[PDB]
């Protein structure tokens, strides 16, 4: 994973996102959704999804939420106050903690001012607590700004490492982007049965055709403009959509 003071930032883009494999995986110790309850994720579409990744203590997972305070949310990783995405977290004691102490996971514990939301700060200047200038050397009131979790496998829960992923769905002003998977089903020809052909919603009896579209045309229309033929997306055969039976 990535440190907590330099989190990663992956920009998921146009694809087919299935948040159900996430939501029901039961391997996650924390799955909170804020802008939008979890079950309705596989039914919406946005412009961009960002995924941020890092590693923290066990009991600092409660500062990854909109409107918190503490050494993590103050100056390591700040979430805006109208967040939209979801926060996922799971314990990872066996991967990240090693006997003798894993001193490779640092965090920032001193900064001049709290972060703006989604702002990032990887500098390593000597912090200056008191009024006396520091001149790049340590000493009283001149502190190195990064500390390291020394993770060890015999730590009580709440001191073992947790891995965190923060999904943030954003909607700029584009034309569209990633959305959840669609559905499907078989085709029953010859029987006034409701139908949906990748967008075309209708009712009627479906029958094998003998017309020939051009190999880029989806459906056919009549004079007076009513849909009367379609092409099945999967098998690519033309079927006449005669209106249902009435009189």
């Amino acid at each position: 994973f990535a440190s907590v003071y330099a989190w990663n930032r992956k920009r998921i883009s146009n694809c087919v996102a299935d948040y159900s494999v996430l939501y029901n995986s039961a391997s996650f110790s924390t799955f909170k959704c804020y802008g939008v309850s979890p079950t309705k994720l596989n039914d919406l579409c946005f412009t961009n999804v960002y995924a941020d990744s890092f590693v923290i203590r066990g009991d600092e997972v409660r500062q990854i939420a909109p409107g918190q305070t503490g050494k993590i949310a103050d100056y390591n990783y700040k979430l805006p106050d109208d967040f939209t995405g979801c926060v996922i977290a799971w314990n990872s004691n066996n991967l990240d903690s090693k006997v003798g102490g894993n001193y490779n996971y640092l965090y920032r514990l001193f900064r001049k001012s709290n972060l703006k939301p989604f702002e990032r700060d990887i500098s390593t200047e000597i912090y200056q607590a008191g009024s006396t200038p520091c001149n790049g050397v340590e000493g009283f009131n001149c502190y190195f700004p990064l500390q390291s979790y020394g993770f060890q496998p015999t730590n009580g829960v709440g001191y073992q490492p947790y891995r965190v992923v923060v999904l943030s769905f954003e909607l700029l002003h584009a034309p569209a982007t990633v959305c959840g998977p669609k559905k499907s089903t078989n085709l029953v020809k010859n029987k006034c049965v409701n139908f949906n052909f990748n967008g075309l919603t209708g009712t009627g009896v479906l029958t094998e055709s003998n017309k020939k579209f051009l190999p880029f045309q989806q459906f056919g229309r009549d004079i007076a403009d009513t849909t009367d033929a379609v092409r099945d997306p999967q098998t690519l055969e033309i079927l006449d959509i005669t209106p249902c039976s009435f009189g």
């Epitope: 050397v137 340590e138 000493g139 009283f140």
Partner: antibody, heavy 125, light 113 residues
């Protein structure tokens, strides 16, 4: 793992080096030091001198005139020379290993963390 | 200057029993930029130096029994030693770098009842 080596009975007014021989760590990386301490009997303790990783030396302002420290990362030691012996300095003389002064709101310098043992000093002719 | 006034002097605590030592800093010694107290508890064995028991007032040192544990708030600072063993005939100290001079606890007699 510190240990303060030195002579046991002293005579007045002369300069006196002092050796806190340690091991288990070095002494030149950002966040490390060793502070030197005395305590006369019945009194509370008195830290005397200190030196950090890039040799940031501290002393008590009272015997700033007489205390003179230097760290020995190579020997895993610290040399502190110290002048003007007097019988109210009848103390046992300690060293204590500093670590990450970010934690520094807990001890009044009196202690630290490591801490060796101490070489006794008595002022008698 | 923030004087550290101990709690129980000639403590006649029985064997295996909760021995209590309070430390009253005269001022609130909390560095509020930590959300965590600092205090260093110490154990002078007679003829021996005081050794660091609990730093951060909640993070016990290595090799130390967890039957000793630290507590305290604001200006009152207690020590939750749950059991007083036969090895505990010693002298104890509490202090703060959050000051200027060498403030001190005064030291307690640990008679084992």
């Amino acid at each position: 793992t510190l240990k303060e080596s030195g002579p046991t009975l002293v005579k007045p007014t002369q300069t006196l080096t002092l050796t806190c021989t340690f091991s288990g760590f070095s002494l030149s990386t950002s966040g490390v030091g060793v502070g030197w301490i005395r305590q006369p009997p019945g009194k509370a303790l008195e830290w005397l001198a200190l030196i950090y990783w890039d040799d940031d030396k501290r002393y008590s302002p009272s015997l700033k005139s007489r205390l003179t420290i230097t760290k020995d990362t190579s020997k895993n030691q610290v040399v502190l020379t110290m002048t003007n012996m007097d019988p109210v300095d009848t103390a046992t003389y300690y060293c204590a290993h500093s670590l990450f002064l970010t934690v520094g709101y807990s001890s009044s310098w009196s202690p630290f963390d490591y801490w060796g043992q101490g070489t006794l000093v008595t002022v008698s002719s | 200057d923030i004087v550290m006034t101990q709690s129980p002097d000639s403590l006649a605590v029985s064997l295996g029993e909760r021995a209590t030592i309070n430390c009253k800093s005269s001022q609130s010694v909390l560095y509020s930029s930590n959300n965590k107290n600092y205090l260093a508890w110490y154990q002078q064995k007679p003829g021996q130096p005081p050794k660091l028991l609990i730093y951060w007032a909640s993070t016990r040192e290595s090799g130390v029994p967890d039957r000793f544990s630290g507590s305290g708030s604001g200006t009152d600072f207690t020590l939750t030693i749950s059991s007083l063993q036969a090895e505990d005939v010693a002298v104890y100290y509490c202090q703060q770098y959050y000051s200027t001079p060498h403030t001190f606890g005064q030291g307690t007699k640990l008679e084992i009842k």
